[PDB]
Design a protein around this motif. Sequence first.
Motif, PDB file in Angstrom:
ATOM      1  N   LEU A 198       6.550   1.958  -6.479  1.00  0.00           N
ATOM      2  CA  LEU A 198       5.480   2.902  -6.257  1.00  0.00           C
ATOM      3  C   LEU A 198       5.736   4.180  -7.065  1.00  0.00           C
ATOM      4  CD1 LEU A 198       5.041   2.533  -2.366  1.00  0.00           C
ATOM      5  CD2 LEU A 198       3.829   1.264  -4.197  1.00  0.00           C
ATOM      6  N   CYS A 199       4.696   4.688  -7.714  1.00  0.00           N
ATOM      7  CA  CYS A 199       4.813   5.973  -8.384  1.00  0.00           C
ATOM      8  C   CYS A 199       4.796   7.058  -7.316  1.00  0.00           C
ATOM      9  CB  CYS A 199       3.695   6.168  -9.410  1.00  0.00           C
ATOM     10  SG  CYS A 199       2.031   6.381  -8.738  1.00  0.00           S
ATOM     11  N   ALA A 200       5.315   8.236  -7.651  1.00  0.00           N
ATOM     12  CA  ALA A 200       5.478   9.305  -6.668  1.00  0.00           C
ATOM     13  C   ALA A 200       4.151   9.683  -6.028  1.00  0.00           C
ATOM     14  CB  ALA A 200       6.128  10.539  -7.316  1.00  0.00           C
ATOM     15  N   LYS A 201       3.082   9.698  -6.821  1.00  0.00           N
ATOM     16  CA  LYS A 201       1.769  10.057  -6.299  1.00  0.00           C
ATOM     17  C   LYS A 201       1.321   9.047  -5.265  1.00  0.00           C
ATOM     18  CE  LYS A 201      -1.605  11.389  -8.914  1.00  0.00           C
ATOM     19  NZ  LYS A 201      -1.886  12.670  -8.200  1.00  0.00           N
ATOM     20  N   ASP A 202       1.690   7.781  -5.467  1.00  0.00           N
ATOM     21  CA  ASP A 202       1.350   6.742  -4.495  1.00  0.00           C
ATOM     22  C   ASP A 202       2.165   6.869  -3.213  1.00  0.00           C
ATOM     23  OD1 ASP A 202      -0.736   5.502  -5.745  1.00  0.00           O
ATOM     24  OD2 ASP A 202       0.434   3.865  -6.608  1.00  0.00           O
ATOM     25  N   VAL A 203       3.467   7.089  -3.349  1.00  0.00           N
ATOM     26  CA  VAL A 203       4.308   7.302  -2.175  1.00  0.00           C
ATOM     27  C   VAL A 203       3.737   8.458  -1.367  1.00  0.00           C
ATOM     28  CG1 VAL A 203       6.595   7.852  -1.295  1.00  0.00           C
ATOM     29  CG2 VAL A 203       6.349   6.441  -3.346  1.00  0.00           C
ATOM     30  N   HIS A 204       3.285   9.491  -2.072  1.00  0.00           N
ATOM     31  CA  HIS A 204       2.688  10.630  -1.386  1.00  0.00           C
ATOM     32  C   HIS A 204       1.401  10.246  -0.666  1.00  0.00           C
ATOM     33  CE1 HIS A 204       0.589  14.512  -0.804  1.00  0.00           C
ATOM     34  NE2 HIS A 204       1.820  14.947  -0.593  1.00  0.00           N
ATOM     35  N   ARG A 205       0.470   9.606  -1.367  1.00  0.00           N
ATOM     36  CA  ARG A 205      -0.832   9.352  -0.764  1.00  0.00           C
ATOM     37  C   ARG A 205      -0.684   8.354   0.394  1.00  0.00           C
ATOM     38  NH1 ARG A 205      -3.696   4.691  -3.901  1.00  0.00           N
ATOM     39  NH2 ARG A 205      -5.565   5.629  -2.968  1.00  0.00           N
ATOM     40  N   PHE A 206       0.282   7.444   0.277  1.00  0.00           N
ATOM     41  CA  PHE A 206       0.487   6.415   1.297  1.00  0.00           C
ATOM     42  C   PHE A 206       1.252   6.949   2.511  1.00  0.00           C
ATOM     43  CE2 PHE A 206       0.233   2.870  -2.128  1.00  0.00           C
ATOM     44  CZ  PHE A 206      -1.142   2.873  -2.028  1.00  0.00           C
ATOM     45  N   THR A 207       1.712   8.196   2.426  1.00  0.00           N
ATOM     46  CA  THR A 207       2.375   8.825   3.566  1.00  0.00           C
ATOM     47  C   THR A 207       1.685  10.115   4.022  1.00  0.00           C
ATOM     48  OG1 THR A 207       3.949  10.007   2.115  1.00  0.00           O
ATOM     49  CG2 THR A 207       4.654   7.871   3.040  1.00  0.00           C
ATOM     50  N   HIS A 208       0.621  10.518   3.334  1.00  0.00           N
ATOM     51  CA  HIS A 208      -0.135  11.717   3.699  1.00  0.00           C
ATOM     52  C   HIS A 208      -1.591  11.395   4.011  1.00  0.00           C
ATOM     53  CE1 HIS A 208       3.429  13.598   2.065  1.00  0.00           C
ATOM     54  NE2 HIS A 208       2.992  14.787   2.440  1.00  0.00           N
ATOM     55  N   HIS A 209      -1.961  11.472   5.288  1.00  0.00           N
ATOM     56  CA  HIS A 209      -3.291  11.069   5.744  1.00  0.00           C
ATOM     57  C   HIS A 209      -3.922  12.144   6.599  1.00  0.00           C
ATOM     58  CE1 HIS A 209      -0.660   7.485   5.495  1.00  0.00           C
ATOM     59  NE2 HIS A 209      -1.681   6.938   4.863  1.00  0.00           N
ATOM     60  N   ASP A 210      -5.236  12.280   6.496  1.00  0.00           N
ATOM     61  CA  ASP A 210      -5.973  13.156   7.394  1.00  0.00           C
ATOM     62  C   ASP A 210      -6.236  12.462   8.717  1.00  0.00           C
ATOM     63  OD1 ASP A 210      -7.903  11.283   6.558  1.00  0.00           O
ATOM     64  OD2 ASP A 210      -9.496  12.771   6.434  1.00  0.00           O
ATOM     65  N   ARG A 219       7.307  -2.040  16.697  1.00  0.00           N
ATOM     66  CA  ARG A 219       6.614  -0.792  16.974  1.00  0.00           C
ATOM     67  C   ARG A 219       5.524  -0.600  15.930  1.00  0.00           C
ATOM     68  NH1 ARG A 219       8.513   3.716  19.322  1.00  0.00           N
ATOM     69  NH2 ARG A 219       9.392   2.132  20.725  1.00  0.00           N
ATOM     70  N   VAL A 220       4.304  -0.331  16.373  1.00  0.00           N
ATOM     71  CA  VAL A 220       3.245   0.043  15.456  1.00  0.00           C
ATOM     72  C   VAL A 220       3.017   1.545  15.624  1.00  0.00           C
ATOM     73  CG1 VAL A 220       0.798  -0.174  14.913  1.00  0.00           C
ATOM     74  CG2 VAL A 220       2.162  -2.221  15.379  1.00  0.00           C
ATOM     75  N   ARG A 221       2.933   2.278  14.523  1.00  0.00           N
ATOM     76  CA  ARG A 221       2.778   3.727  14.603  1.00  0.00           C
ATOM     77  C   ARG A 221       2.159   4.294  13.335  1.00  0.00           C
ATOM     78  NH1 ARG A 221       6.326   6.340  11.362  1.00  0.00           N
ATOM     79  NH2 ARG A 221       8.471   5.609  11.028  1.00  0.00           N
ATOM     80  N   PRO A 222       1.513   5.460  13.442  1.00  0.00           N
ATOM     81  CA  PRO A 222       1.041   6.101  12.212  1.00  0.00           C
ATOM     82  C   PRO A 222       2.188   6.378  11.244  1.00  0.00           C
ATOM     83  CG  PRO A 222      -0.112   7.025  14.090  1.00  0.00           C
ATOM     84  CD  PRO A 222       0.957   6.100  14.650  1.00  0.00           C
ATOM     85  N   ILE A 223       1.920   6.167   9.965  1.00  0.00           N
ATOM     86  CA  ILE A 223       2.834   6.554   8.892  1.00  0.00           C
ATOM     87  C   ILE A 223       2.769   8.081   8.734  1.00  0.00           C
ATOM     88  CG2 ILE A 223       3.360   6.373   6.398  1.00  0.00           C
ATOM     89  CD1 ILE A 223       2.026   3.561   6.448  1.00  0.00           C
ATOM     90  N   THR A 224       3.917   8.743   8.689  1.00  0.00           N
ATOM     91  CA  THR A 224       3.933  10.203   8.625  1.00  0.00           C
ATOM     92  C   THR A 224       4.488  10.702   7.309  1.00  0.00           C
ATOM     93  OG1 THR A 224       6.168  10.718   9.403  1.00  0.00           O
ATOM     94  CG2 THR A 224       4.525  10.130  11.092  1.00  0.00           C
ATOM     95  N   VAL A 225       4.444  12.018   7.127  1.00  0.00           N
ATOM     96  CA  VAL A 225       4.945  12.624   5.906  1.00  0.00           C
ATOM     97  C   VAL A 225       6.449  12.400   5.746  1.00  0.00           C
ATOM     98  CG1 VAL A 225       3.118  14.355   5.903  1.00  0.00           C
ATOM     99  CG2 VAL A 225       5.283  14.876   7.008  1.00  0.00           C
TER     100      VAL A 225
END
Lengths: 115, 165
Positions: B53-65, B18-24
């Motif tokens: 991954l540092c927390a800020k990275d986990v966040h940015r890699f799961t939070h997208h516009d 399955r390919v899908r957008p990464i979500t929060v």
Amino acid sequence: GTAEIESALVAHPKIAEAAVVGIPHAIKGQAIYAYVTLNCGEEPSPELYAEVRNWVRKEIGPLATPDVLHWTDSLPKTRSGKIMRRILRKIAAGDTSNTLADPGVVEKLLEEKQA
Amino acid sequence: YPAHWEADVVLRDGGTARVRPITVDDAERLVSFYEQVSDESKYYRFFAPYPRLCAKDVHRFTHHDFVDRVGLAATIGGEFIATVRYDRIADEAEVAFLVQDAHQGRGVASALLEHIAAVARERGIRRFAAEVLPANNKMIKVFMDAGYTQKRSFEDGVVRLEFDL
């Protein structure tokens, strides 16, 4: 090589990230210049310096001990997070007459190097 | 996000992922995935050792516009086996991907590159650029096969690959 030294540095409990470049030194043959980011809550000190170098010396060997430990919050990275090693080489070598995510990091690296 | 951004893709062995957008909601999945990536592949992905991954990275890699930044995952049984993303630099964006070593060569990287391009075309991206370490020939070949071309290379041996969308 540099990856071995970086891996050893990151292995240190107080070190979060590391990127190492080799640059010609006129006195030494080659100098090992290490940019290092401490983990949150950790702070640089005169003695953390010797601890880290002693750490590398034990893990890898005296030949791999960094000559310079450049503490920073400011590793230069592309937006995908890739380290811009070419910028680090230029700054460590003083070769600074000329994808980067945050341009502000360069000024901070240059300041830290003169300090 | 558009429903057609989530899709089953066919792997080389004939099965599907399955390919899908990464979500929060995918922080835990991303972290578990990253645990299964080899030190070597992490090095190739970040150009330095980056064991967790540092927390800020986990966040940015799961939070997208999902306009300036898009991240997609390939999953099997709900588990991440690969990610791909773009970051607008302009109508140019940097692209990066990462596949668990055990799942290399299955067609996952190729599918993700096709899918991220398709999304980019919908969001007004005109070109992709990727930086790759010169010794990482597996990754370079994935990009080559996807139609990327070498634009230039730098003092540190890093290659800049570009793809007109």
